[PDB]
Amino acid sequence: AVLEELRQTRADLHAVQGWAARSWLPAGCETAILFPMRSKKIFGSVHPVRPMRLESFSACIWVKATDVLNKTILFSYGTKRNPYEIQLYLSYQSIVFVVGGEENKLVAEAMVSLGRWTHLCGTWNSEEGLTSLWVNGELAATTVEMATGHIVPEGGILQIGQEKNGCCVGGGFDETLAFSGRLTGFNIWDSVLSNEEIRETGGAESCHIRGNIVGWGVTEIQPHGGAQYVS
Amino acid sequence: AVLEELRQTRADLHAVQGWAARSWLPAGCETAILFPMRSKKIFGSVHPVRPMRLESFSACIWVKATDVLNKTILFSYGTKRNPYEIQLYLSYQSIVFVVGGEENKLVAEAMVSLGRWTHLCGTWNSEEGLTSLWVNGELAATTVEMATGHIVPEGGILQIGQEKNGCCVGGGFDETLAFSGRLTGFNIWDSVLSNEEIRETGGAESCHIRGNIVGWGVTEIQPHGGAQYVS
Amino acid sequence: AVLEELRQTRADLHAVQGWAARSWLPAGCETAILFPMRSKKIFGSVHPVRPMRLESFSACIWVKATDVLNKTILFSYGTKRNPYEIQLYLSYQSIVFVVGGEENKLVAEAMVSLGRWTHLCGTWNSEEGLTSLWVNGELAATTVEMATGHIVPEGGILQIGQEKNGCCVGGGFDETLAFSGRLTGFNIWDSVLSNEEIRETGGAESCHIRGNIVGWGVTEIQPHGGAQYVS
Amino acid sequence: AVLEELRQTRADLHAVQGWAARSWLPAGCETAILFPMRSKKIFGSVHPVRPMRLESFSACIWVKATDVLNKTILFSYGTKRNPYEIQLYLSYQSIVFVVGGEENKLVAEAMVSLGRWTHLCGTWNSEEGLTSLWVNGELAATTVEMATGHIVPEGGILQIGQEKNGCCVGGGFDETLAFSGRLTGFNIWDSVLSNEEIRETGGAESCHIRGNIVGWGVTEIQPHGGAQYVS
Amino acid sequence: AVLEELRQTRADLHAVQGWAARSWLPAGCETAILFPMRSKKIFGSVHPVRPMRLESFSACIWVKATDVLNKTILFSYGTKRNPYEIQLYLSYQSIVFVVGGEENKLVAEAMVSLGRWTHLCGTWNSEEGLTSLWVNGELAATTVEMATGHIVPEGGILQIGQEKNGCCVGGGFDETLAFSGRLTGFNIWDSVLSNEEIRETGGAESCHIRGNIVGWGVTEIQPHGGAQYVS
Amino acid sequence: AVLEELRQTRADLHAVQGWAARSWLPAGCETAILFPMRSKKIFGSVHPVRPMRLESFSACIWVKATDVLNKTILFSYGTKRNPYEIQLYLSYQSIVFVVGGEENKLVAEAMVSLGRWTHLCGTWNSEEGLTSLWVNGELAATTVEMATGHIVPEGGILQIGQEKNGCCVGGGFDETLAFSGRLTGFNIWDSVLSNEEIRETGGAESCHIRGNIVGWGVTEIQPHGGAQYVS
Amino acid sequence: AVLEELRQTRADLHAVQGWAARSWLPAGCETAILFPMRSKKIFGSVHPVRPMRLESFSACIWVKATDVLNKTILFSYGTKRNPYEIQLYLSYQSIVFVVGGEENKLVAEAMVSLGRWTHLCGTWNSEEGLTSLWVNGELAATTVEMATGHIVPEGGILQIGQEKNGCCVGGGFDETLAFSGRLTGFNIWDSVLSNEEIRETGGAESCHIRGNIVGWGVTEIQPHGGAQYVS
Amino acid sequence: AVLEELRQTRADLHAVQGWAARSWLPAGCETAILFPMRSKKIFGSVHPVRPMRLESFSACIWVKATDVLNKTILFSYGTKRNPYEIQLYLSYQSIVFVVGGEENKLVAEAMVSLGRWTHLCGTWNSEEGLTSLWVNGELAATTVEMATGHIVPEGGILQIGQEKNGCCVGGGFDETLAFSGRLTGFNIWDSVLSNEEIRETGGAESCHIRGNIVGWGVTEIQPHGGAQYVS
């Protein structure tokens, strides 16, 4: 009796199953930025209140990439002299973390899926260049003495979904570099997070641990070019 | 006991039944463009990165038409000399595919419903003009030697929901030509898709197969005039 | 066993109960206009393609009013000479239908609730001025020989939520006249709808019967001043 | 049998549990303002129709603060001469109510949570300065003879999420003062609400009791700088 | 000797003769409004600080009409009920002054030239409707008992170059009624000016006598649609 | 004595000589459109009130071209089907008039100077295609039976300085075809002007003879992309 | 002979006499701000690079007032706490300099003409409040011990033509306080200028002496509401 | 007789002397860009049609600087990697030409005046780095083997009045580097100009010699931030 009716109740709930699953957001975040397209002018400007005069930093982010090219920028900090200060991006299947210069990069192979949220986070300290990438909370890659003894200066432009090219011409950003998908939980810290801290940054009810420099839901992140807040 | 309570549980879930059903999206697409009204200025501009110098193409699309007139444009590619290069549209009850010139068209009669999503897709190769229309994955119509030996040139304007008229006067598009409804999953390929490929393009978890020329969620599709992204 | 866990399943579904109920829309309409506030500049312009040279008309509408004043305009058609051609509005508790002139009005007392959708609809034919108001499908009021032998001319401005005052000064509309709430299913017909037609216009799956003059989801309705499309 | 199936039914409903919980709104409010970030230009201007020439007032509000600093403004009324006429704000953990002057403040310690809605409401009468703060319906703090014999004049600017600084320079608001979170049910009364009235203002189906001076869903509350209506 | 070189000096000054003559402005006026075209939406809004609750008024204007149709509006004040309260316009060759309603008007035949500045001033007192038109300082046409015992109420919209038709439709102003040319010295008084005052208003150094209700260079005149301030 | 001081008077007037000469305008025209650069999106839309359903037409224009390429468009009228209905342009040194189609055209060799105003007027009647080009009032080149028995239809877009390419893509107009310089006195007639009328149109005090279809200072000309009205 | 022709040469030059006189600018200034009207929202923001933490200051300005009311503001610097820090304004016929607060002010009677440029410069040093007003280079009125021992703090907003009221309400500036006319040569110094320097600031070729804090043609002055640069 | 009246004629012409002198433009240039202030965001973008893949180039510009700081940029071309490719700027009194990098530069001491137009042209060929600076047509300073064997690549942004800092942050350009004054005749050539050509570029009727890469009145120059075209 009850089982038979439960059959049709489940059949009905199937309609809302996918509708709720498609708009699900990771952690406890109630807002995210949507890049519906790889444009020549789509990006998001971040305006940290605290200066970026940082020697050690651990930048985490929740990403869901619809299409990943040879080079797709998640977030990137770049000054006038050197546009590749901090730059997390995605290759065809790997994740690349660039600190200091374009030549100093750390690559973690084949642990990013397209339509699934992943907590990509990258740590780096200037004492000996001990850089690491954690994906979904477990170590993905690590290297030492890369960009060692380097300090990212102030005045640089930090963006999400693009690299420093400027939009004083009505865009001008390289389309192939753009990011198309969803971003949330963008946090940057002034110190190397501990292992447990990195694990708990990408948990279930974890969208309330925000960095001091850039904090999701606190810092001025304004999208441009077509990106929008999908609350 | 449990059955009685299940009665009221189902009665309660009835309230969310329609609310979830009305905003349901086809395939796995999490975003779509809404044309709430037939205006003189409503359309959506598409900006393919790859040039449209194509001899064979298979253009798929998910459409839900609120009202269909004698001539309602779903998508249309048109150059300066000939505005009817590629044009998929809807008659009162039939679906029309135009390639090359307005005289060359293929008509499939009475398989489009108003308030229901349908995966209209049109294939065409210039070797002998073998054109086809598949609706919901099964062949709807086919013809041979139409617009044969024709090449759609570059520089043309591609739009969704309207035809090439231009909006340098504050609109100017013919209202009767406009489209009012919902569009999603707009993909254009550079080659004739195989039968299984066409079948799987309009499946359940099928909103991740995108064309190389125009790909939903990848290409710059910007609405104008009142059209908007209903995420 | 099953009953006990069903208790907590219902407790869980309670959280989504109200969230789905609050954004529920009447009929089968998937889109509506939200007037969040009574501003000096909030309204919605309607642009019928067919001229308003009508002798008989039946104008239906779905309304949910957050706050109703001495005079709150739902929709209003007004020419340059006479701004009170057609005007449906709400008094403190009654519904008023004005056709032809401000002196010719029909009042139906105390059948409008604030936070609940109601299908207010008004019919009028110029042969003898036989005007009627139906609320939720059942007759609310009726009168004869009011504005008889009158023809509403063309060129008039039709708005939803305000009356004809113009916004060439940055607003100027009377705040007290404004409408704050939700509107959907705005339809105007060129003929007096039959009783069954009026009953089925405000049904359950009834948001696909649209008028020839103004049709919800077909005609150009553009909000202004703060009103927005709440899909 | 039924129990086993109910196990996976609950497992499935878990996906929509959090999705519905994250966008839940308090009382019966169907609309709210979202401050996604602490910008230099984010706020919301309120335009009461009735003048603020009030001697006694009870200002209620529903707030959900993502991050609370040393000084975070929920709402603030300020004239040209004295910008601190009325100002409700949040310290690190306490709630502060300022009436008349910045020196006259009432502080209620440690009853505000970050990610949870709370019905903060403040009452004040000028007969003897008997001011009170109610949090979630129960008394949080109270004092007497503070700003006694004072009248808040007219012409002042009332904002939500910021204090009176002006935005004729492209912002200029102090970032640290800004509010980042969600606001709803902003009501201001011309008289001291009774205890039962304050209790029922922050109830379950209580988002229909609105003040005469400022009423949520009635008064012109236009956000600026990045604040949004999250319907 | 000197006489011979004077010929070349005059020939040189010839190049600046016309260039200075074309941009010459009448009276001592240093600024004027240019209506380059008869757009569908060209006009200028006037926002008098003092209310238009006037019984007797004198209104002057310096006009240079590039093209005059059957009906070309210089300025027009109109309320919601009656859009033809005050309206000065030009027929093919005559000047028409309308006060109260279209039925009662004053016409002065054939004293307006196209490319030449003319100082048109219409006066009217409600005691007996004694209305007069003065062109370039000399009386043109006078009538008595027209719109007698009439009072132009407040709230009406006053414009230059168009009638009261509203621009909430993206224009909508009748193209034919538009004004294309140059306007300056728009003044409206609360009392019928004396003959000597009328003569002095249209003098040489006379762009410093301005009306109390509307005063050129003091009142808020906002051009729209293509009209611009030609300083 | 007088001659000596006249020397310095002439020396002084030298400073204003060039300043007045550079901003000189031809005919009695007091306004003109300036195309400072050959932008990708610079043009001017023209919106004739009278439809372009014309069989015979004479079109004049005063032009001062800063730089003339292989193809520089002064004005161009083009429909959706055929964008080359009417098109007057400049080759490296010649003036080209196109009516009907690109195949049939009239060319007048080497009578256009760059920095000097020239009055180019092309006439054409459909009775036998008798087309003529008049430069500065004297006939330049005439031909017969070109585009004979052809009628330019309605709906076509008419622009100055560009072709019909549409700006819904944020521009897209071919840069090379653009016009950079100054334009004025754009007039189009519904009949072939007589020889004396053609001479008078390009006279000294001749900026008051305007066409019925398009008339300078009467028709609606909207510059776009960087073009502006240089009064 | 020469004298006779010189008569007509002078008659010719008469046409350009007034045209050049009306647009004349004082000093060697090549640009100025025009306030065509006393709008509700007309002003000009000034953004000094150097902070206003000044104890002694001299502030000059060239002013030409079309209409002067009971209180018309030339420039005004005001902080959040005290909006009347520095404020130079005009009464019906006198010039008023306000430093520190409203109570302490300096008044110079009847030396301002409406349509004539005047060089008003107010100096003030905090050692003993020795404040002075210089009009056209000759001292107008001086006082001692007014606002003595006072320091104007930083963060205050400095405007020309209005007070500190804010425009986040779409204006809100008091209309009466507005300034309508022309302004130029706005300079503010960090030290009390010497008498010879004061005289030289208002000379003939004197639009190249600019203050260190605010300098005309160097400091960032943005007109708003209708004000514009009349070059 | 004639001499006496000529005295007053000269006295009258004195009034227009300065008014014509202040708006005088050099060469035969009829248009120029005005930088009224040193805003945080004032500049002008230049969009050369021909790519900047140049080995030898000569770049001229007419400049009139109101205020010159330690570093004031006239024009600057900079790529992403190296923002200092080409950069002409002014020190306190000298003119500096930078090609390749900041380390290698050419300085010409003390030949720039503030309020006077000067024709600064820098030439450089990569064969041996033979760079030269010509001021007003006479060589100022030359050097050899500086940036030798260097090629300025494509994609770099070229601006007038600022460096390459990007305006995606709502400005961000360094205020000190900005340029405040007037610019015209901006030309860049693909080959080192000859000495006679250099002299002719800065002549009297010399505003018709324009470069192939960037040509004044041909290339797309868009002012931003407050800069405007002073025709």
Ligand SMILES: *[C@@H]1O[C@H](CO)[C@@H](O)[C@H](O)[C@H]1NC(C)=O
């Ligand atoms: C992938 O991108 C890198 C730079 O990010 C590039 O060096 C490499 O060649 C690319 N792989 C290709 C093009 O196959």
Ligand SMILES: *[C@@H]1O[C@H](CO)[C@@H](O)[C@H](O)[C@H]1NC(C)=O
């Ligand atoms: C339907 O549209 C076609 C063109 O798309 C037209 O030829 C045909 O006449 C229309 N049918 C009608 C008007 O009944």
Ligand SMILES: *[C@@H]1O[C@H](CO)[C@@H](O)[C@H](O)[C@H]1NC(C)=O
């Ligand atoms: C209600 O409104 C009507 C006009 O719509 C007005 O005549 C009447 O006086 C109002 N009732 C009041 C003010 O009590």
Ligand SMILES: *[C@@H]1O[C@H](CO)[C@@H](O)[C@H](O)[C@H]1NC(C)=O
């Ligand atoms: C908290 O803010 C108050 C003012 O609102 C301030 O006086 C106090 O010092 C702050 N507490 C700190 C800075 O620890």
Ligand SMILES: *[C@@H]1O[C@H](CO)[C@@H](O)[C@H](O)[C@H]1NC(C)=O
């Ligand atoms: C001129 O205009 C008036 C109304 O302004 C109109 O009545 C009259 O017919 C017009 N004259 C014509 C059309 O010849």
Ligand SMILES: *[C@@H]1O[C@H](CO)[C@@H](O)[C@H](O)[C@H]1NC(C)=O
């Ligand atoms: C000049 O332009 C025409 C088309 O307008 C073109 O056919 C011709 O080749 C051009 N001349 C050249 C490129 O030398």
Ligand SMILES: *[C@@H]1O[C@H](CO)[C@@H](O)[C@H](O)[C@H]1NC(C)=O
């Ligand atoms: C002039 O203005 C002052 C304040 O600026 C005011 O106190 C005074 O009353 C005014 N004079 C009048 C209103 O006659």
Ligand SMILES: *[C@@H]1O[C@H](CO)[C@@H](O)[C@H](O)[C@H]1NC(C)=O
């Ligand atoms: C002038 O500017 C240069 C850089 O352009 C700088 O190195 C130098 O120190 C400056 N001179 C000063 C600050 O006196």
